[PDB]
A paper describes a structure:
Cyclodipeptide synthases (CDPSs) use aminoacylated tRNA (aa-tRNA) substrates to form peptide bonds between two amino acids yielding a cyclic dipeptide product (CDP). ParaCDPS from Parabacteroides sp. ParcuCDPS belongs to the XYP sub-group of the CDPS family, characterised by the presence of 3 residues: X40 where X is a non-conserved residue, Y202, and P203 (numbering respective to AlbC). ParcuCDPS displays a Rossman-fold common throughout the CDPS family.
By mutating the P1 residues, the activity of the variants was vastly reduced with E174A and E174H incapable of tolerating histidine as a substrate. Further investigation into the changes imposed by these mutants was performed by solving the crystal structures of a select few mutants containing changes to the active site or the pocket residues. The mutant structures were able to be solved using WT as a model and retained an equivalent fold to ParcuCDPS (Supplementary Notes 4 and 7 relating to Supplementary Figs. 13 and 14). Therefore, the disruption of activity is caused exclusively by the change in these few residues which appear important for the enzyme to produce a CDP. This was because Generation 1 and 2 variants essentially incorporate hydrophobic and non-polar amino acids potentially altering the overall environment and electrostatics of P1.
Numbering used by the authors: 1 to 4, 11 to 60, 70 to 230
Write the structure that this text describes.
Amino acid sequence: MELHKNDIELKKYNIGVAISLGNKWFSIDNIEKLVKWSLLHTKEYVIIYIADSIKLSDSHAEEVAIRYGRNLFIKIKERVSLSFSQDEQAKIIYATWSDIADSKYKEKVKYLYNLYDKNINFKNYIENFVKEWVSKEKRTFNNNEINKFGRYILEELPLLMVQVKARGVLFEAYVYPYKTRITEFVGLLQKGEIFPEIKTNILDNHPKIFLEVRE
Protein backbone atom coordinates (compact mmCIF):
# COMPACT_ATOMS: atom_id res chain seq x y z
CA MET A 1 0.00 0.00 0.00
CA GLU A 2 0.95 3.67 -0.16
CA LEU A 3 -0.05 7.06 1.24
CA HIS A 4 -2.99 8.66 -0.57
CA LYS A 5 3.19 14.08 2.73
CA ASN A 6 6.82 15.15 2.59
CA ASP A 7 6.88 14.97 6.39
CA ILE A 8 6.21 11.22 6.10
CA GLU A 9 9.00 10.13 3.76
CA LEU A 10 11.14 12.33 6.01
CA LYS A 11 9.91 10.10 8.85
CA LYS A 12 8.81 13.04 11.02
CA TYR A 13 5.97 11.28 12.88
CA ASN A 14 5.18 8.24 14.97
CA ILE A 15 2.31 6.30 13.43
CA GLY A 16 -0.69 4.70 15.08
CA VAL A 17 -2.58 1.78 13.49
CA ALA A 18 -6.29 2.10 14.34
CA ILE A 19 -8.07 -1.26 13.95
CA SER A 20 -11.86 -1.21 13.52
CA LEU A 21 -12.92 -4.57 14.89
CA GLY A 22 -15.82 -5.87 12.83
CA ASN A 23 -15.07 -3.79 9.74
CA LYS A 24 -14.64 -6.30 6.94
CA TRP A 25 -11.49 -4.59 5.62
CA PHE A 26 -9.43 -5.22 8.75
CA SER A 27 -8.60 -8.82 8.05
CA ILE A 28 -5.40 -10.11 9.58
CA ASP A 29 -3.59 -9.74 6.27
CA ASN A 30 -4.67 -6.15 5.71
CA ILE A 31 -3.66 -5.46 9.29
CA GLU A 32 -0.25 -6.97 8.53
CA LYS A 33 0.06 -4.69 5.52
CA LEU A 34 -0.78 -1.56 7.52
CA VAL A 35 1.77 -2.51 10.16
CA LYS A 36 4.50 -3.17 7.57
CA TRP A 37 3.76 0.22 5.96
CA SER A 38 3.91 1.93 9.33
CA LEU A 39 7.21 0.27 10.32
CA LEU A 40 8.69 1.51 7.05
CA HIS A 41 7.46 5.08 7.43
CA THR A 42 7.48 5.70 11.17
CA LYS A 43 9.91 8.01 12.95
CA GLU A 44 10.47 5.26 15.51
CA TYR A 45 7.36 3.54 16.84
CA VAL A 46 4.14 1.99 15.62
CA ILE A 47 1.22 1.92 18.07
CA ILE A 48 -1.54 -0.63 17.45
CA TYR A 49 -4.94 -0.19 19.07
CA ILE A 50 -8.62 -1.00 18.67
CA ALA A 51 -10.49 2.07 17.52
CA ASP A 52 -14.27 1.35 17.34
CA SER A 53 -17.00 -1.22 16.58
CA ILE A 54 -19.27 0.48 13.96
CA LYS A 55 -21.77 -5.70 30.42
CA LEU A 56 -18.34 -6.09 31.97
CA SER A 57 -17.15 -2.47 32.11
CA ASP A 58 -18.57 1.02 32.36
CA SER A 59 -16.80 2.03 29.13
CA HIS A 60 -17.71 0.50 25.76
CA ALA A 61 -14.15 0.77 24.44
CA GLU A 62 -12.91 -1.01 27.55
CA GLU A 63 -15.57 -3.69 27.14
CA VAL A 64 -14.51 -4.19 23.50
CA ALA A 65 -10.86 -4.33 24.60
CA ILE A 66 -11.30 -7.14 27.11
CA ARG A 67 -13.82 -9.13 25.08
CA TYR A 68 -12.05 -9.01 21.72
CA GLY A 69 -8.89 -6.93 21.60
CA ARG A 70 -6.93 -9.39 23.71
CA ASN A 71 -7.44 -12.23 21.23
CA LEU A 72 -7.03 -9.99 18.21
CA PHE A 73 -3.70 -8.77 19.60
CA ILE A 74 -2.62 -12.37 20.19
CA LYS A 75 -3.29 -13.23 16.55
CA ILE A 76 -1.43 -10.09 15.51
CA LYS A 77 1.55 -10.90 17.71
CA GLU A 78 1.82 -14.38 16.19
CA ARG A 79 1.63 -13.16 12.60
CA VAL A 80 4.09 -10.35 13.28
CA SER A 81 6.71 -12.57 14.86
CA LEU A 82 6.55 -14.73 11.71
CA SER A 83 6.61 -11.84 9.19
CA PHE A 84 9.02 -9.34 10.75
CA SER A 85 12.61 -9.35 11.93
CA GLN A 86 13.07 -9.24 15.68
CA ASP A 87 14.42 -5.70 15.57
CA GLU A 88 11.47 -4.50 13.50
CA GLN A 89 9.26 -6.12 16.16
CA ALA A 90 10.96 -3.87 18.72
CA LYS A 91 9.25 -0.84 17.12
CA ILE A 92 5.69 -2.08 17.80
CA ILE A 93 3.58 -1.22 20.86
CA TYR A 94 0.23 -2.88 21.55
CA ALA A 95 -1.81 -0.24 23.33
CA THR A 96 -4.93 -1.36 25.18
CA TRP A 97 -7.71 1.04 26.03
CA SER A 98 -6.21 1.67 29.48
CA ASP A 99 -2.86 2.64 27.91
CA ILE A 100 -4.64 5.42 26.01
CA ALA A 101 -7.42 6.39 28.42
CA ASP A 102 -5.24 8.11 30.98
CA SER A 103 -6.66 10.72 33.32
CA LYS A 104 -5.99 13.59 30.89
CA TYR A 105 -7.85 11.76 28.11
CA LYS A 106 -10.79 11.07 30.41
CA GLU A 107 -11.38 14.76 31.12
CA LYS A 108 -11.73 15.35 27.38
CA VAL A 109 -14.25 12.49 27.20
CA LYS A 110 -16.10 13.90 30.21
CA TYR A 111 -16.33 17.26 28.48
CA LEU A 112 -17.95 15.55 25.50
CA TYR A 113 -20.41 13.52 27.59
CA ASN A 114 -21.41 16.67 29.45
CA LEU A 115 -21.90 18.47 26.15
CA TYR A 116 -23.89 15.46 24.84
CA ASP A 117 -26.34 15.75 27.75
CA LYS A 118 -26.67 19.55 27.66
CA ASN A 119 -26.39 20.66 24.01
CA ILE A 120 -29.31 19.31 22.05
CA ASN A 121 -27.85 20.49 18.74
CA PHE A 122 -24.78 18.40 19.56
CA LYS A 123 -26.90 15.49 20.80
CA ASN A 124 -28.99 15.47 17.66
CA TYR A 125 -26.01 15.78 15.34
CA ILE A 126 -24.24 12.83 16.97
CA GLU A 127 -27.41 10.74 16.85
CA ASN A 128 -28.32 11.50 13.24
CA PHE A 129 -24.70 10.54 12.69
CA VAL A 130 -25.27 7.06 14.11
CA LYS A 131 -28.64 6.91 12.34
CA GLU A 132 -26.98 7.35 8.97
CA TRP A 133 -24.19 4.83 9.57
CA VAL A 134 -26.73 2.17 10.55
CA SER A 135 -29.29 3.00 7.87
CA LYS A 136 -27.05 1.00 5.53
CA GLU A 137 -26.98 -1.95 7.93
CA LYS A 138 -29.74 -4.45 7.33
CA ARG A 139 -30.42 -4.58 11.09
CA THR A 140 -32.45 -1.89 12.85
CA PHE A 141 -32.02 -0.04 16.15
CA ASN A 142 -34.13 1.92 18.62
CA ASN A 143 -33.52 5.48 19.79
CA ASN A 144 -32.04 4.47 23.14
CA GLU A 145 -29.59 2.23 21.28
CA ILE A 146 -28.90 5.00 18.78
CA ASN A 147 -28.22 7.28 21.72
CA LYS A 148 -25.91 4.73 23.34
CA PHE A 149 -23.98 4.33 20.09
CA GLY A 150 -23.47 8.09 20.11
CA ARG A 151 -21.76 8.10 23.50
CA TYR A 152 -19.45 5.38 22.20
CA ILE A 153 -18.29 7.68 19.42
CA LEU A 154 -17.62 10.49 21.90
CA GLU A 155 -15.39 8.08 23.80
CA GLU A 156 -13.05 7.73 20.80
CA LEU A 157 -13.38 11.30 19.55
CA PRO A 158 -10.47 12.88 21.50
CA LEU A 159 -8.11 10.17 20.23
CA LEU A 160 -9.17 11.13 16.72
CA MET A 161 -8.65 14.84 17.33
CA VAL A 162 -5.61 15.27 19.56
CA GLN A 163 -2.15 13.72 19.86
CA VAL A 164 -2.02 11.52 22.98
CA LYS A 165 0.44 9.14 24.60
CA ALA A 166 0.18 5.36 24.88
CA ARG A 167 2.57 3.83 27.40
CA GLY A 168 4.46 7.13 27.41
CA VAL A 169 4.79 7.39 23.61
CA LEU A 170 3.39 10.29 21.64
CA PHE A 171 2.09 9.36 18.20
CA GLU A 172 1.24 12.33 15.98
CA ALA A 173 -0.20 10.42 13.03
CA TYR A 174 -2.41 7.44 12.40
CA VAL A 175 -3.19 5.35 9.34
CA TYR A 176 -6.59 4.40 8.01
CA PRO A 177 -7.47 2.92 4.60
CA TYR A 178 -10.07 5.52 3.50
CA LYS A 179 -11.92 8.71 4.40
CA THR A 180 -15.05 8.28 6.53
CA ARG A 181 -17.90 10.48 7.74
CA ILE A 182 -16.04 10.47 11.04
CA THR A 183 -12.74 11.61 9.53
CA GLU A 184 -14.53 14.50 7.78
CA PHE A 185 -16.29 15.45 10.99
CA VAL A 186 -13.02 15.35 12.90
CA GLY A 187 -11.41 17.49 10.21
CA LEU A 188 -14.12 20.11 10.69
CA LEU A 189 -13.84 19.98 14.47
CA GLN A 190 -10.06 20.48 14.38
CA LYS A 191 -10.53 23.55 12.19
CA GLY A 192 -13.17 24.98 14.52
CA GLU A 193 -15.70 24.91 11.69
CA ILE A 194 -18.26 22.71 13.43
CA PHE A 195 -19.10 22.89 17.16
CA PRO A 196 -16.20 25.31 17.80
CA GLU A 197 -16.53 25.09 21.58
CA ILE A 198 -15.02 21.63 21.22
CA LYS A 199 -11.84 22.93 19.61
CA THR A 200 -11.55 25.58 22.31
CA ASN A 201 -11.92 23.05 25.09
CA ILE A 202 -10.07 19.88 24.12
CA LEU A 203 -7.61 20.70 21.29
CA ASP A 204 -4.21 21.99 22.44
CA ASN A 205 -3.08 23.18 18.96
CA HIS A 206 -1.38 19.84 18.08
CA PRO A 207 -3.99 18.04 15.96
CA LYS A 208 -3.90 14.32 15.31
CA ILE A 209 -2.78 13.76 11.71
CA PHE A 210 -4.81 11.36 9.55
CA LEU A 211 -2.89 9.45 6.84
CA GLU A 212 -4.92 7.58 4.23
CA VAL A 213 -3.18 4.36 3.16
CA ARG A 214 -4.73 1.72 0.88
CA GLU A 215 -3.70 -0.55 -2.00
